[PDB]
Design a protein around this nucleic acid. Structure first.
Ligand code: SF4
Ligand SMILES: [Mg+2]
Ligand SMILES: [Mg+2]
Ligand SMILES: [Mg+2]
Ligand SMILES: [Mg+2]
Ligand SMILES: [Mg+2]
Ligand SMILES: [Mg+2]
Ligand SMILES: [Mg+2]
Ligand SMILES: [Mg+2]
Ligand SMILES: [Mg+2]
Ligand SMILES: [Mg+2]
Ligand SMILES: [Mg+2]
Ligand SMILES: [Mg+2]
Ligand SMILES: [Mg+2]
Ligand SMILES: [Mg+2]
Ligand SMILES: [Mg+2]
Ligand SMILES: [Mg+2]
Ligand SMILES: [Mg+2]
Ligand SMILES: [Mg+2]
Ligand SMILES: [Mg+2]
Ligand SMILES: [Mg+2]
Ligand SMILES: [Mg+2]
Ligand SMILES: [Mg+2]
Ligand SMILES: [Mg+2]
Ligand SMILES: [Mg+2]
Ligand SMILES: [Mg+2]
Ligand SMILES: [Mg+2]
Ligand SMILES: [Mg+2]
Ligand SMILES: [Mg+2]
Ligand SMILES: [Mg+2]
Ligand SMILES: [Mg+2]
Ligand SMILES: [Mg+2]
Ligand SMILES: [Mg+2]
Ligand SMILES: [Mg+2]
Ligand SMILES: [Mg+2]
Ligand SMILES: [Mg+2]
Ligand SMILES: [Mg+2]
Ligand SMILES: [Mg+2]
Ligand SMILES: [Mg+2]
Ligand SMILES: [Mg+2]
Ligand SMILES: [Mg+2]
Ligand SMILES: [Mg+2]
Ligand SMILES: [Mg+2]
Ligand SMILES: [Mg+2]
Ligand SMILES: [Mg+2]
Ligand SMILES: [Mg+2]
Ligand SMILES: [Mg+2]
Ligand SMILES: [Mg+2]
Ligand SMILES: [Mg+2]
Ligand SMILES: [Mg+2]
Ligand SMILES: [Mg+2]
Ligand SMILES: [Mg+2]
Ligand SMILES: [Mg+2]
Ligand SMILES: [Mg+2]
Ligand SMILES: [Mg+2]
Ligand SMILES: [Mg+2]
Ligand SMILES: [Mg+2]
Ligand SMILES: [Mg+2]
Ligand SMILES: [Mg+2]
Ligand SMILES: [Mg+2]
Ligand SMILES: [Mg+2]
Ligand SMILES: [Mg+2]
Ligand SMILES: [Mg+2]
Ligand SMILES: [Mg+2]
Ligand SMILES: [Mg+2]
Ligand SMILES: [Mg+2]
Ligand SMILES: [Mg+2]
Ligand SMILES: [Mg+2]
Ligand SMILES: [Mg+2]
Ligand SMILES: [Mg+2]
Ligand SMILES: [Mg+2]
Ligand SMILES: [Mg+2]
Ligand SMILES: [Mg+2]
Ligand SMILES: [Mg+2]
Ligand SMILES: [Mg+2]
Ligand SMILES: [Mg+2]
Ligand SMILES: [Mg+2]
Ligand SMILES: [Mg+2]
Ligand SMILES: [Mg+2]
Ligand SMILES: [Mg+2]
Ligand SMILES: [Mg+2]
Ligand SMILES: [Mg+2]
Ligand SMILES: [Mg+2]
Ligand SMILES: [Mg+2]
Ligand SMILES: [Mg+2]
Ligand SMILES: [Mg+2]
Ligand SMILES: [Mg+2]
Lengths: 137, 231, 208, 148
RNA sequence: CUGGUCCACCCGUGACGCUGAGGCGCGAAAGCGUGGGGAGCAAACCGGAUUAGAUACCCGGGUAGUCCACGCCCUAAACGAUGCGCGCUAGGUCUCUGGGUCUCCUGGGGGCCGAAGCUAACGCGUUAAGCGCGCCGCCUGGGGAGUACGGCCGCAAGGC
RNA sequence: AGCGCCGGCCAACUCCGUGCCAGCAGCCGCGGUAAUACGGAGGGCGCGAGCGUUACCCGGAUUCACUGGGCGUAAAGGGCGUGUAGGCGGCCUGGGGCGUCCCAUGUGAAAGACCACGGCUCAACCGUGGGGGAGCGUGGGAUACGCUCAGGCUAGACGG
């Protein structure tokens, strides 16, 4: 397994697309900080450090919109879109002046700075750049 | 107005020709057969009826849908009890999505009634007598319950959401609420007010359909319950 | 240079009265009153649904022919307005109206912009005491467009100014009649100039 | 009152012994220039019937466009089949920068200032469909916060 | 004599891994070299038919070859026309082969139907053509042309 | 006052002449006796001391795709392994601070470009003032991520 960060974002995407309540990703401190941002911004209900057959995991609790009416009752996603930006095969770093605005403000870009994991708004308010990890809306 | 003699009446069937979306309404599997979670049926029957009663206390019609040979008369009686439209024979595609056109068929049934108001010149060629009489019985077989409905219904009640998939498909395209009895072979998310329980046992169909109209009549005035139910 | 040939055919082609002649534009012998159909052999035949290119070309030819301006100068003004920060539609019309030959017409010194140009080009006009014979001059706020006093005893300009006596000009203007001088207040608006033109369709014609 | 625009009228053909027999289809957009648009594709044995029939479905398939000062809230990209549409918010003095098909839908929904680009297959039908679905997924700060 | 692979135990090592330009090895048939072998079959070839004709299809013959050893050749509709590895995303059914507490369950294979999703459609769908990461190979209108020239390889045919 | 154009793309239509001829043509296509497509004319459209043509560059061409494409059947998976360099790489702790991020500072000539004002009657042209950037040098700071060094782990991998 070559990219746990993109594997987690992908674990979340596959889970939300079939409306599961939770899914387990193997745990790591860098992932916790990433999920810490998704809960505080409301893309997930939250998480907890759980244990699957003796191994340290993270159980991520998803949230969706209200049931819909018509032919397709499936409720609207809260995480419409999440994808890896910087990757092992190509690192992506921006300065503070070139941080992007995901979805015209309505989206978050998750960064790894030397002040820890931040959002594009947090990084702009602290005047620091870093590695552009992913983007959510 | 609920109960718990459902336990003596169904708790489901149908081995593992199941639907995984129907998992959360299952308790466990007995001798190679799925068993419904009657408590989940209870809490759903509560929510389901809370909607039904509100529709009775507002003059809304409920088009009852049952074509399987098990629920074909149970649906005929209990829907006639409340004087609500049913469909017992073939469900006709477009009974909602093309309602004006299938309704153009009861007006024919209507005028075929008033034609046999003798004479209205029933001094027609005898080959025309048994002809229109055929079309009358014919229309009678399929429209005897749909005629009562003379506008888009406000909700529908289905005994097998898998069997009556077309009716569910029509009601959803028209934003009309769907309530239904359903066991393991059915897609839960396609129903709006679910009653997870056996839909092959007349014991179960009668119990749920009769208790359905027991609310309908009591919420339109005049609580009277003793209804036919073949042993 | 500028267009010189028949000007009624322009109106008849655009399907709208363009007031390009002065007072015959208001008579009953205006061509639009007598034949409000396009010029030429097929004017009276039933029109076909015009293409979106047609629609946008026509609106642009209207706005242009109104000022009797070349496509070259017309397009440079549009390109100036297009770079300028702010809404390009407003600035375009604003720059158009800020032409000396246009202001001279607005002040009623001349019945038509054509007449204004032959007025300006013949030096019969001044700006802030400076004689200016250039139709393209961009009049700015606070200016002052008078008749050349060494021309103030001229029949055409007097008879014209007579009919302007007490006549309103646009809000963005002011006319000291009797003294034969006017003032450019500020560059006007889409509201001030009700031109029979959706100028937004001209933005679209040039974006193609 | 709803305004309509015909986007496309085409004649198709089917063969048989005897020769080809024709049919017509009308892409018709309908809207009020205030935030409601509909797209219907109507097909009938003659042009006027199919055009009227198109406006019928157009009213039966409306979409609510979160207009904000005449532009859309956020940028969006949508792929309907092999056709792709790109919509990008734009400031007051911009205009509707779009091909004939996406322009007619945006214009009738009251979109005064937007940047667009057609990518992939530029099939007028599939592009028109792709533009509706793009408008249909536009969300506001309200909707976003409401969801979280 | 010898390779790969699966399962159960969860005992040892402690990231020792993935991919892989070049290189190296393997590589159906036909073909080639030396030497064997040669029943049946059968290119070429001869004859009989068929047919307007019949350098074919059908029939009767028939030499290479088909077979063995060693050495070459290195191609293919060499195909799942689908590169390898990993993680993730409903199920139903048939089957091969292990381990169970043997109904059933759980591993590893081989199919069929299908969830969500994908796709231009056909179709794919836990054996992905879905959702992602890594690395390699490759495409960039048809013909000219897999030709010409150069280079490298081969005994040649001819290959790259 | 001239030049191009008026089948479609593309804005502008009629009459005659011609009759697969003479000719037109950027592409699709026009022409064989009622041609909006050839030739003239009348009319019209578009520009105007210009208007057309030819050549070439960028655009439309996300048609070499970093932004921003693909390879079952459209062009596209190497016939298959094995493996060199290279690219890429699991969980926890600490050291260093190479990449990376921030601050200061030097450099980033003038012209040009851009915003403003001004001078030639306007403009073109020109003058005056204003705003920065990357990139690189130096100094100071940060340590999440990638890197490196050290220690530990067993979920990958490998052995019993
Ligand atoms: S007379 Fe009428 S048609 Fe002629 S220029 Fe004046 S307004 Fe136009
Ligand atoms: Mg990128
Ligand atoms: Mg059933
Ligand atoms: Mg006027
Ligand atoms: Mg602007
Ligand atoms: Mg006014
Ligand atoms: Mg006006
Ligand atoms: Mg442009
Ligand atoms: Mg349709
Ligand atoms: Mg498409
Ligand atoms: Mg696509
Ligand atoms: Mg905006
Ligand atoms: Mg295309
Ligand atoms: Mg095309
Ligand atoms: Mg909305
Ligand atoms: Mg062990
Ligand atoms: Mg140890
Ligand atoms: Mg390998
Ligand atoms: Mg190799
Ligand atoms: Mg071989
Ligand atoms: Mg061989
Ligand atoms: Mg041989
Ligand atoms: Mg030979
Ligand atoms: Mg041999
Ligand atoms: Mg020899
Ligand atoms: Mg022979
Ligand atoms: Mg012969
Ligand atoms: Mg012969
Ligand atoms: Mg022979
Ligand atoms: Mg033979
Ligand atoms: Mg033989
Ligand atoms: Mg032989
Ligand atoms: Mg031979
Ligand atoms: Mg030989
Ligand atoms: Mg051999
Ligand atoms: Mg095969
Ligand atoms: Mg294979
Ligand atoms: Mg191949
Ligand atoms: Mg691939
Ligand atoms: Mg066994
Ligand atoms: Mg195998
Ligand atoms: Mg299997
Ligand atoms: Mg299948
Ligand atoms: Mg599906
Ligand atoms: Mg794809
Ligand atoms: Mg699974
Ligand atoms: Mg399966
Ligand atoms: Mg497999
Ligand atoms: Mg594919
Ligand atoms: Mg490979
Ligand atoms: Mg070629
Ligand atoms: Mg070859
Ligand atoms: Mg060759
Ligand atoms: Mg050669
Ligand atoms: Mg090859
Ligand atoms: Mg031209
Ligand atoms: Mg023609
Ligand atoms: Mg043109
Ligand atoms: Mg035209
Ligand atoms: Mg001749
Ligand atoms: Mg002819
Ligand atoms: Mg003729
Ligand atoms: Mg032509
Ligand atoms: Mg001609
Ligand atoms: Mg000039
Ligand atoms: Mg030139
Ligand atoms: Mg080019
Ligand atoms: Mg390019
Ligand atoms: Mg790319
Ligand atoms: Mg492509
Ligand atoms: Mg091919
Ligand atoms: Mg292969
Ligand atoms: Mg090879
Ligand atoms: Mg690492
Ligand atoms: Mg490394
Ligand atoms: Mg450290
Ligand atoms: Mg470290
Ligand atoms: Mg450093
Ligand atoms: Mg600097
Ligand atoms: Mg400089
Ligand atoms: Mg000046
Ligand atoms: Mg300067
Ligand atoms: Mg700049
Ligand atoms: Mg530094
Ligand atoms: Mg270590
Ligand atoms: Mg292990
Ligand atoms: Mg092992």
């Amino acid at each position: 397994l070559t990219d746990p960060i993109a594997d987690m974002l992908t674990r979340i995407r596959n889970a939300t697309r079939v409306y599961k309540e939770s899914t387990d990703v193997p745990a790591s401190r860098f992932k916790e900080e990433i999920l810490r941002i998704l809960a505080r911004e409301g893309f997930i209900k939250g998480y907890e450090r759980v244990d699957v057959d003796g191994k340290p995991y993270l159980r991520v609790y998803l949230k969706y919109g209200p049931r819909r009416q018509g032919p397709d009752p499936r409720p609207e996603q809260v995480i419409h879109h999440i994808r890896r930006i910087s990757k092992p095969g190509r690192r992506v770093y921006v300065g503070v002046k070139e941080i992007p605005r995901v979805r015209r403000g309505l989206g978050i870009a998750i960064l790894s700075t030397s002040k820890g994991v931040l959002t594009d708004r947090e990084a702009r308010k602290l005047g620091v750049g870093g590695e552009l990890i992913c983007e959510v809306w | 107005v609920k109960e718990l003699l459902e336990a003596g009446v169904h708790f489901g069937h149908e081995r593992k020709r199941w639907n995984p979306k129907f998992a959360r309404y299952i308790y466990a599997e007995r001798n190679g057969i799925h068993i419904i979670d009657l408590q989940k049926t209870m809490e759903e029957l509560e929510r389901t009826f809370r909607f039904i009663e509100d529709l009775a206390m507002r003059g809304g019609t409920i088009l009852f849908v049952g074509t399987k040979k098990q629920a074909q008369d149970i649906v005929r009686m209990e829907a006639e009890r409340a004087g609500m439209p049913y469909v017992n024979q073939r469900w006709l595609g477009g009974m909602l999505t093309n309602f004006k056109t299938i309704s153009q068929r009861v007006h024919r049934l209507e005028e075929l009634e008033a034609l046999f108001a003798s004479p209205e010149i029933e001094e027609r060629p005898k080959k025309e007598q048994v002809r229109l009489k055929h079309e009358l019985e014919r229309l009678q077989k399929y429209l005897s319950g749909f005629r009562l409905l003379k506008r888009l219904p406000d909700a529908i009640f289905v005994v097998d959401p898998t069997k009556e998939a077309i009716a569910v498909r029509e009601a959803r395209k028209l934003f009309i609420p769907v309530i239904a009895l359903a066991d393991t072979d059915s897609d839960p998310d396609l129903v709006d007010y679910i009653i997870p329980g056996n839909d092959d046992a007349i014991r179960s169909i009668q119990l749920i359909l009769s208790r359905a109209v027991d609310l309908i009549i009591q919420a339109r005035g005049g609580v009277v319950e003793p209804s036919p139910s073949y042993a | 240079g500028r267009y010189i040939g028949p000007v009624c055919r322009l109106c008849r082609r655009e399907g709208v009265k363009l007031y390009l002649k002065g007072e015959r534009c208001y008579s009953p012998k205006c061509a639009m009153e007598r034949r409000p159909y396009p010029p030429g052999q097929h004017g009276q035949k039933r029109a076909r649904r015009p293409s979106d290119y047609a629609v946008r070309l026509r609106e642009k030819q209207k706005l242009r022919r109104i000022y009797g301006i070349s496509e070259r100068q017309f397009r440079n003004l549009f390109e100036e307005a297009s770079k300028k920060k702010g809404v390009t539609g407003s600035v375009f019309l604003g720059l158009l109206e800020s032409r000396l030959d246009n202001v001279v017409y607005r002040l009623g010194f001349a019945v038509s912009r054509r007449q204004a140009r032959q007025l300006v080009r013949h030096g019969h006009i001044t700006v802030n005491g400076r004689r200016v014979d250039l139709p393209s001059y961009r009049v700015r706020p606070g200016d002052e467009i008078a008749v050349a006093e060494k021309s103030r005893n001229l029949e055409l300009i007097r008879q014209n100014l007579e009919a302007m006596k007490g006549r309103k000009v646009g809000p963005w203007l002011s006319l000291d009649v009797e003294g034969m001088k006017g003032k450019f207040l500020r560059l006007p608006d889409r509201e001030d100039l009700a031109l029979p033109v959706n100028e937004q369709l001209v933005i679209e014609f040039y974006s193609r | 009152d709803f305004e309509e625009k015909m986007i496309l009228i085409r004649r198709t053909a089917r063969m048989q012994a005897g020769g080809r027999r024709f049919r017509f289809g009308a892409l018709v957009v309908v809207g009020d220039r205030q935030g409601r648009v509909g797209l219907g594709f109507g097909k009938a044995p003659e042009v006027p019937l199919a055009v009227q029939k198109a406006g019928y479905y157009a009213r039966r398939n409306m979409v609510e466009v979160p207009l904000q000062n005449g532009t859309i809230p956020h940028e969006i990209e949508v792929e309907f089949g092999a056709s792709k549409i790109v919509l990008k918010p734009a400031a007051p003095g911009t205009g509707v920068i779009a091909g004939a098909v996406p322009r007619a839908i945006l214009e009738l929904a009251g979109v005064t200032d937007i940047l667009t680009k057609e990518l992939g297959s530029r099939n007028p039908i599939n592009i028109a469909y792709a533009t509706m679905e793009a408008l249909r997924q536009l969300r506001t700060k309200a909707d976003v916060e409401r969801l979280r």
